[PDB]
Design a binder for this molecule. Structure first.
Ligand SMILES: [Zn+2]
Length: 108
């Protein structure tokens, strides 16, 4: 849509293991929660997402101050994940090792 990437931040559930972590240099599991950052591309004519694990956003260490505005894709999350993403932004981040999965079929 118009100005779809005029944000800083993205959050969503992972449909498949096609995204890779720009922060811890591993790959992101499917049927799990992930975040990304909106950066101006050297290779593309606009803003592009830098994907990483949900905990890895808070290892990049950015603050979020109006999360339902700044975190694109938050509208697709269910209430328990919306409450946890907003609570994590109020809490100043959560930074643990996260999932044991990496992007494979039936990895849970
Ligand atoms: Zn990671």
């Amino acid at each position: 849509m118009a100005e779809s990437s005029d944000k800083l931040y993205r959050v969503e559930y992972a449909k498949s293991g096609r995204a890779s972590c720009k922060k811890c240099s591993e790959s992101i599991p499917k049927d799990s929660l992930r975040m990304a950052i909106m950066v101006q591309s050297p290779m593309f004519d606009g803003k592009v997402p830098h994907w990483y694990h949900f905990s890895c956003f808070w290892k990049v260490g950015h603050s979020i101050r109006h999360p339902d505005v700044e975190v694109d894709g938050f509208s697709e999350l269910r209430w328990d994940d919306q409450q946890k993403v907003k609570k994590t932004a109020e809490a100043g981040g959560v930074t643990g090792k996260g999932q044991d999965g990496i992007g494979s079929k039936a990895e849970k």
